[PDB]
Amino acid sequence: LKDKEKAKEWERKEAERIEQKLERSEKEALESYKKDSVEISKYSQTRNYFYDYQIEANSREKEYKELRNAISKNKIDKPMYVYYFESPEKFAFNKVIRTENQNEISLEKFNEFKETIQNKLFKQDGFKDISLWEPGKGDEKPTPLLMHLKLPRNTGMLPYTNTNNVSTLIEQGYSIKIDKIVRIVIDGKHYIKAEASVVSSLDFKDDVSKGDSWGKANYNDWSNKLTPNELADVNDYMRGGYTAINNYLISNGPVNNPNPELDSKITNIENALKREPIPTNLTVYRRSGPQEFGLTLTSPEYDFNKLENIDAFKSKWEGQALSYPNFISTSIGSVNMSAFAKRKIVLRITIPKGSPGAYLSAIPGYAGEYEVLLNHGSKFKINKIDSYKDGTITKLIVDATLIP
Numbered sequence: 248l249k250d251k252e253k254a255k256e257w258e259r260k261e262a263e264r265i266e267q268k269l270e271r272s273e274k275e276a277l278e279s280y281k282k283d284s285v286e287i288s289k290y291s292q293t294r295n296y297f298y299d300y301q302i303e304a305n306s307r308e309k310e311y312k313e314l315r316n317a318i319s320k321n322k323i324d325k326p327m328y329v330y331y332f333e334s335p336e337k338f339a340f341n342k343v344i345r346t347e348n349q350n351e352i353s354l355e356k357f358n359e360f361k362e363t364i365q366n367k368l369f370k371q372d373g374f375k376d377i378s379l380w381e382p383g384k385g386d387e388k389p390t391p392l393l394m395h396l397k398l399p400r401n402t403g404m405l406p407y408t409n410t411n412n413v414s415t416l417i418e419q420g421y422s423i424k425i426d427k428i429v430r431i432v433i434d435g436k437h438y439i440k441a442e443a444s445v446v447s448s449l450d451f452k453d454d455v456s457k458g459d460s461w462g463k464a465n466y467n468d469w470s471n472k473l474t475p476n477e478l479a480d481v482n483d484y485m486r487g488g489y490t491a492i493n494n495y496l497i498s499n500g501p502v503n504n505p506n507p508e509l510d511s512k513i514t515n516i517e518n519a520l521k522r523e524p525i526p527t528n529l530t531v532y533r534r535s536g537p538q539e540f541g542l543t544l545t546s547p548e549y550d551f552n553k554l555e556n557i558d559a560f561k562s563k564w565e566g567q568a569l570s571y572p573n574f575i576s577t578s579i580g581s582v583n584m585s586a587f588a589k590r591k592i593v594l595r596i597t598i599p600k601g602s603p604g605a606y607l608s609a610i611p612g613y614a615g616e617y618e619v620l621l622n623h624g625s626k627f628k629i630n631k632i633d634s635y636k637d638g639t640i641t642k643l644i645v646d647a648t649l650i651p
């Protein structure tokens with residue numbers, strides 16, 4: 248736990264042991280990592296949001312895949328705790344816990360951080376260097392926030408040597424919940440120690456073929472579980488009826504201009520989506536237009552190239568609920584597509600096991616790929632908003648959870 252001498256000796260011994268296992272290509276990727284860790288780790292966070300050809304061609308993509316593979320071949324046989332420092336902004340606490348010159352963290356700030364991270368899951372992605380022991384009076388402590396994360400059995404972990412130093416690499420690909428926070432003292436300064444655990448979610452990211460295999464496996468027989476009316480209304484919807492149905496819902500037609508024929512279709516589609524609930528925690532992706540967030544294509548606020556507009560968007564939406572009156576299309580894949588080339592908001596949604604939903608792309612012939620349809624009137628809790636550059640265009644990733 249705080250046993251530095253033990254963990255470093257073990258870590259070094261393990262590094263030198265694993266080094267004999269690695270493929271030449273993996274050793275090559277590791278050599279590159281030692282030289283360019285910041286940019287490779289950043290790449291590993293957002294690589295999957297670009298086009299397939301951008302992914303393929305990227306100067307860091309082969310390095311990513313090799314490092315990914317190497318990490319996976321050293322799986323832990325029991326659960327293990329790891330330590331790493333984190334920015335409070337990572338958990339949507341968009342301010343300092345204390346300045347780096349200050350020693351103390353006020354009770355108010357401690358409690359405010361607690362309230363911010365409560366009852367939320369946060370998606371974690373990309374390579375990370377971690378420590379096996381609690382950083383002490385002699386280590387690099389770049390932030391007032393120290394994560395103490397329990398990694399589950401069979402998590403990949405790669406100890407490696409870098410000059411005279413030893414580090415351990417993981418690839419994050421899960422959500423975390425912060426179960427407890429405690430104010431600790433290290434070398435005369437207060438830190439927040441956050442006790443965290445992993446919650447898993449099936450997340451294909453750019454691997455649309457595996458996602459499709461899963462979707463069809465789970466929804467090939469979905470049509471056969473529907474009544475004649477349900478199947479006919481789902482068909483109508485997928486064949487182009489979605490426009491009239493969703494416009495009616497968005498404009499609150501059921502109240503202001505009731506159409507009982509449409510009401511019936513909506514009821515049938517909802518029952519169809521409740522017929523075979525999402526069988527596991529699943530991550531889906533939606534490329535959202537401005538109107539879904541109360542903006543238009545010509546809103547000055549939609550220009551996320553200006554930092555002011557990101558801060559304004561976060562202030563409005565982060566930690567808040569978002570509800571769609573219409574049925575919501577999403578994809579199992581995170582890749583950009585020509586149809587949504589310039590859309591600036593990526594909704595990254597965790598669907599809890601048992602939620603209404605269906606993999607529509609399992610229906611034969613249907614011209615539409617990798618699609619998961621969610622129920623009308625769905626509510627989404629926004630945990631965290633991130634930004635990234637897509638060429639010259641700043642885009643946003645909205646980490647949300649589908650809630651009751």
Ligand SMILES: NC(=O)C1=CN([C@@H]2O[C@H](COP(=O)(O)OP(=O)(O)OC[C@H]3O[C@@H](n4cnc5c(N)ncnc54)[C@H](OP(=O)(O)O)[C@@H]3O)[C@@H](O)[C@H]2O)C=CC1
Pocket residue numbers: 497532533534535536537538539542543570571572573576577578586587617618619
């Ligand atoms: N978007 C995605 O990532 C995915 C889309 N699909 C399917 O691909 C096709 C084209 O995609 P898309 O353009 O999204 O078509 P959609 O029918 O999903 O949306 C059409 C327009 O309606 C606007 N809109 C949607 N919901 C709301 C809302 N609640 N409030 C206000 N405005 C809203 C959108 O934003 P705005 O007007 O600001 O641009 C969009 O321009 C559709 O058949 C869709 O079902 C399948 C998988 C994923």
